[PDB]
Design a protein around this ligand. Structure first.
Ligand SMILES: O=C(O)CCC(=O)C(=O)O
Ligand SMILES: O=C(O)CCC(=O)C(=O)O
Ligand SMILES: [Fe+2]
Ligand SMILES: [Fe+2]
Ligand code: NA
Ligand code: NA
Lengths: 282, 282
């Protein structure tokens, strides 16, 4: 089944598993303290969403979602966006296309009563973008548990082998379903090629996942970042600024795009980095 | 040869010419007054560039370039980005991919001594993006003359028929070179599929072109717009804001991406539009 790694594992082997299998698990990708911070950051927005074409209008019964985590989560913008293993894996995964950045960071909360989904792949279908077993990787979703994913709350089902297929496919003897159990802070790295579906939540608990969707930076993210203040952006590392569309990005020809004066976008406007954040201060 | 249209021509016929031929000309696409304003806006930056990997470091001998025209040209951000015929043509051209936005707006000034270029296509090659005679359109460059393009200053050469070829190709009897003459304000609409090269500038004059490069909004622009102030952005029309990555954009599934709270990016932050500009005021 799906290879399970730790935070100390070789990114080369994690990348190999993603290429071969379409999916890999990192146990303890986040620490329990990080999980705690992230849950506290999204408690109020999730409660507000729940208490209520745009994709906001297509959220399934009993599911609440909150997007644009950079806007309001200190942990997300400083810890998650600088996650060293995430970056080692993404650099290898997207090497053919060049740099990568954040397609979106969100939390999805499946409440009791959430129903099993249809088989799908995560990658949007665009006429201009190559897709399929032999295409370059178009996305990686570090699908991170913030609560337990078990038999009751729902384990995501992956059709092993489906990353090699053109059609979504059905499980057979040689492509059985794996139901992936996760402890909070474990992540399943989901390629755009692997067929999967979430399960029923038939427990009494909220089941929360934080997709960290990474895409090649030649493609537009789902979550906009253009409204973020220069103040907030300047508290971030240069790497994390690059993940939110505030720095130039490299393409193989490497040369830069997303530029100012045909040069690096941040440097040309004097963009600072690593400045102290108001929320860390008294 | 290349079909020549006017500002009153049917966009359906212009689009047909782009699909069939890979190139179309609109005479009087800009008015002489617009040409005058644009030239005055770029005079100082061009002089500064001339008086001197990133593409800034690969500009050919005797050529000066200035990018990011939205930042400093009132005419560009209010007149060009709202050009009604440009939009009718782009909506038809990019219908398979959804919405479109500004890949870059620049002025290229070929001084006396500028040499004929190598045959090329304008569209960057990315492993993930389909290219070729049968691929969806990946870019349209409204290559707009700001000075005369004639035998002396240099007419751009297009290999007629090359949009149907996989390789760049060479002119033959059935794919002859067309040298396109332009008066200031005439535009050649250049698809990403047509093989072409600029000519020598063997005159005593500066030869200026303003590429208005439009790309599907699923793709990242060459010119960043993330540093523009909310003040400046709020002076623009909602359409022009969309061209500079400040509004959500539609994809066929239509649904929106580049979102805030999975909804329209500007509306969610209360983005104003059509506000009076400081440079129009006393
Ligand atoms: O896997 C899940 O439980 C839901 C995440 C997912 O598959 C999706 O919503 O696209
Ligand atoms: O056509 C020209 O004269 C120069 C514009 C062009 O072809 C290019 O620089 O890519
Ligand atoms: Fe999924
Ligand atoms: Fe060109
Ligand atoms: Na693979
Ligand atoms: Na065509």
């Amino acid at each position: 089944g799906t290879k399970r790694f730790s935070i100390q594992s070789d990114p080369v082997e994690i990348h190999r598993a993603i290429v071969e299998d379409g999916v890999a698990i990192i146990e303890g990708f986040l620490t329990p303290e990080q999980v705690q911070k992230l849950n506290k950051d999204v408690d109020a927005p999730l409660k507000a969403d729940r208490e209520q074409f745009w994709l906001a209008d297509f959220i399934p019964d009993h599911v609440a979602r909150v997007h644009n985590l950079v806007d309001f989560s200190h942990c997300f913008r400083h810890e998650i966006l600088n996650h060293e293993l995430l970056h080692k894996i993404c650099r290898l995964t997207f090497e053919e296309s060049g740099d990568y950045w954040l397609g979106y960071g969100a939390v999805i909360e499946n409440g009791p009563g959430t129903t099993e989904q249809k088989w799908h792949r995560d990658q949007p279908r665009y006429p201009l973008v190559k897709e399929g077993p032999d295409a370059p990787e178009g996305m990686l979703n570090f699908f991170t548990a913030l609560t337990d994913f078990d038999a009751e709350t729902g384990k995501t089902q992956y059709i092993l082998g489906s990353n090699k297929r053109v059609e979504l496919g059905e499980p057979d003897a040689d492509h059985p379903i794996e139901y992936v159990g996760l402890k909070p802070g474990d992540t399943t790295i989901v390629s755009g090629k692997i067929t999967h579906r979430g399960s029923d939540n038939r427990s009494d608990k909220m089941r929360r996942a934080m997709p960290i969707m990474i895409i090649p930076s030649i493609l537009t993210p789902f979550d906009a970042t253009c409204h973020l203040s220069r103040e907030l952006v300047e508290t971030m590392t240069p790497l994390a600024q690059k993940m939110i569309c505030r720095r130039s990005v490299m393409i193989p020809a490497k040369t830069g795009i997303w530029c100012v004066n045909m040069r690096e976008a941040g440097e040309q406007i004097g963009l600072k980095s690593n400045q102290r954040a108001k929320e860390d201060a008294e």
